[PDB]
Ligand binder design. Structure first.
Ligand SMILES: [Fe+3]
Length: 138
């Protein structure tokens, strides 16, 4: 049996924060389910190029709006209830107009290494600036 809760996972080591996304890992390679499962927030206004050569991924949008553009393929608007699956290891752009909440399934599971290495992803456009600078302790 495995039981977890998103509200425990946030702001912990299984919550991986990147420029363009915040991935809350629900099932890890360690959990032995044969897939990994996460709840990923794609930050508003961002663009990320994605290419998983060594996994297939299912993505189920439960909040927000954006689009996925397949390289050499079509562009599919993302809205709540939209699902895409990269069974062809498609190279694609993932764009978030508003923040998107995505339930994602990877086969085989992603490893902690791969998530922290940001393997398979290339962040291209980060969220608009909130006026902060690294050199402003405040
Ligand atoms: Fe994707």
């Amino acid at each position: 049996m495995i039981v977890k809760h998103l509200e425990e996972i946030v702001d912990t080591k299984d919550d991986i924060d990147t420029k363009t996304w915040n991935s809350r890992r629900l099932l890890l390679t360690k959990d032995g389910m044969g897939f990994s499962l996460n709840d990923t927030l794609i930050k508003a206004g961002t663009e990320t190029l994605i290419w998983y050569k060594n996994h297939v991924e299912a993505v189920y949008c439960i909040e927000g709006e954006g689009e996925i553009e397949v390289i050499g393929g079509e562009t599919y608007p993302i809205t709540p209830g939209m699902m895409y699956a990269l069974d062809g290891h498609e190279k694609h752009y993932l764009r978030a107009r508003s923040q998107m909440r995505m339930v994602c399934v990877f086969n085989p599971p992603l490893t902690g290494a791969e998530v922290h290495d940001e393997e398979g992803t290339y962040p291209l456009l980060a969220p608009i600036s909130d006026g902060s600078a690294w050199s402003h302790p405040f």
